[PDB]
Amino acid sequence: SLIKNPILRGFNPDPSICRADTDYYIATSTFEWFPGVQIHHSKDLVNWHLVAHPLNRTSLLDMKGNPNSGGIWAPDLSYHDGKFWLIYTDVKVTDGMWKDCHNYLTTCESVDGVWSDPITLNGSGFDASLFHDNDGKKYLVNMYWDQRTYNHNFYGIVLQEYSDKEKKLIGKAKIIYKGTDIKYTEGPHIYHIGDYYYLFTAEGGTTYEHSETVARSKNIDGPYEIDPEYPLLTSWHDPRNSLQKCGHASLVHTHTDEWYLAHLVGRPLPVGNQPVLEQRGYCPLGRETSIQRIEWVDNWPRVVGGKQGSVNVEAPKIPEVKWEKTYDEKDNFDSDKLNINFQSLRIPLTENIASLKAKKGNLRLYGKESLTSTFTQAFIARRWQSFKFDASTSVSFSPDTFQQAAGLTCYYNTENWSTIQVTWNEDKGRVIDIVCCDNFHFDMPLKSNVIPIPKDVEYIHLKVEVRVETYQYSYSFDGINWSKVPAIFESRKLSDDYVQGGGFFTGAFVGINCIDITGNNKPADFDYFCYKEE
């Protein structure tokens, strides 16, 4: 039938699409969220399911203390010589005149297997991508960073041979391409198709000015000619399109000899009765992945349906394979494996932080550092993947100080979040309370009007109802009757477009956490986690 974009919803940027015989994979960036690199699978490009996170051990990925929207930027997944190859970037500095980062290569016979110890590559820029040429040679391309303050930082595309035999980059690196006048030249992928090397790049920056352009050359070294009809993909000029920020693309040639282009987009909340060119939108689901049909004209790729990118796209000629949901709407924590849709911040969880074993049918979180910490948070979360949903939990917790809190949280980064918590007060004992951070402005809007929790309540039920432009928390002591808490939040405030700083690259999550400042590691028992889209 039809592909319906986005195919990968909520936080799923920088799609790297990869064909392995008749299997299709997209790797997306995960930034500070662990484990690293989401890999989704499809047989038909219409239906997708989340199946792996290769970077799942400290030896592959060490992001303790990483800044928000540092860590895993755009990943590159390829398949060649009977194995998968993953190029990844760990970004350590996300703002200023430098973007210190490190690029690595790991491999694996399957995407869900145990990936090899990483090979050190370079760090001259992010967006490293591995090209396997048909003569058996291999090359890394990446953007080359120019820190000089009076220059634009995006110096062009650097190319260097990689040797699998020597496990290193070899020979000299060369700038092969400088990009167009749109600039922000990044995301390089090379494809050798017929008589040309095609160099695909993202341009314009990952905002509403995002695009993809194609250039081509008879030789890998260039010089590359820019498509006369550049860009290939962009909706910058069309503020009304459902898909915005169209860029950072990768190309696949299906086994059915068809051509598809994966790319990221943003889908703004309704902007309302406001100037359409000035207010391009807020995107709480972050950067999602969409896919377009490609046709060839005069040996240049072209986006079918127009460069703005379409929502409803002609599917390839492949019999459909639908997938079961990869989570239960109500997760009862009856398995010793945490659901693949849950991630934690920066580091691998250990039994000292989170346990499914300590108490059957519960997730026990042992309190760690606050919601503001870039080190160790006892906190697991999953993506908002719709503008309307309910998420909920119930938690058993016995705090005896305000330094202890456990609850349900909507979270973007360390200075942009809100939460409803079970905590403690000197005069009222156990209470429900609300805390939030709006671009590093902190508030507790209930003040003294916290809600006392009766001593005989074992599990406090906590719910968030996300309703497009706003959301609100509720609680229940019996799991049947719910009371609203009078604090209404704006969803746009958990968006790429609202958050401050050089790194604005993830999206809204909802999850559950336990804070214990005292160092006593107080446990909170969560009986379940629900997430139901409407």
Footprint on this chain of a second copy (rule: CB under 8 A): 64-66, 92-93, 95-98, 100, 102-103, 120-124, 145-152, 173, 181-184, 204-205, 209, 236-237, 240, 273-278, 369-370, 372-375, 402-403, 415, 435, 437, 440, 442-444, 447, 517-520
Q: Which of 64, 43, 16 is nearest to 373 (CA)?
A: 64
Phi, psi of 398 (to 5 degrees): -120, 75
CB of 524 to Ca ion, least distance (A): 13
Q: What 3-state DSSP class applies to 414?
A: coil
332 is in an annotated binding site: yes
361 is in an annotated binding site: yes
# chain residues binding Ca ion, by CB under 5 A: 5
Q: Catalytic: which of 14, 288, 390, 433?
A: 14
Contact 184, 213 (CB under 8 A): no
State the binding partner of 480 from a second copy, Ca ion, none, CB within 5 to 8 A by kind. none
Is residue 361 at the binding interface for Ca ion, with CB under 5 A as the rule?
A: yes
Q: How far is CA 258 from the centre of its chain?
A: 28
Q: Catalytic: which of 44, 76, 127, 186?
A: 186
Contact 239, 276 (CB under 8 A): yes
Contact 265, 288 (CB under 8 A): yes
State the binding partner of 333 from Ca ion, a second copy, none, CB within 5 to 8 A by kind. Ca ion
CA 452, CA 450: separation in Å to the nearest integer?
6
CB of 7 to a second copy, least distance (A): 27
Q: Which of 78, 72, 4 is nearest to 35 (CA)?
A: 72
Q: For residue 278, give Cα distances in angstroms to 221, 234, 271, 274, 494.
A: 41, 17, 10, 8, 20
Q: Which of 248, 272, 334 is nearest to 27 (CA)?
A: 248
Is residue 332 at the binding interface for Ca ion, with CB under 5 A as the rule?
A: yes
Reading the block at residue 308, the tokens are: 């703005």
Contact 355, 520 (CB under 8 A): no
Contact 249, 206 (CB under 8 A): no
Q: For this structure, is 221 an active site residue?
A: no
- Indicate the residue among 333 and 411 with the shorter CB distance to Ca ion: 333
Is residue 479 at the binding interface for Ca ion, with CB under 5 A as the rule?
A: no
439 is in an annotated binding site: no
Q: Choose the binding region for Ca ion from 147-155, 331-339, 423-431, 434-442 (rule: CB under 5 A).
A: 331-339
Q: For this structure, is 14 an active site residue?
A: yes
CB of 138 to a second copy, least distance (A): 17
CB of 382 to a second copy, least distance (A): 24
CB of 332 to Ca ion, least distance (A): 4
Is residue 527 at the binding interface for Ca ion, with CB under 5 A as the rule?
A: yes
Catalytic residues: 14, 186
Annotated binding site for Ca(2+): 332, 361, 527
Q: Known binding site: residues?
A: 332, 361, 527
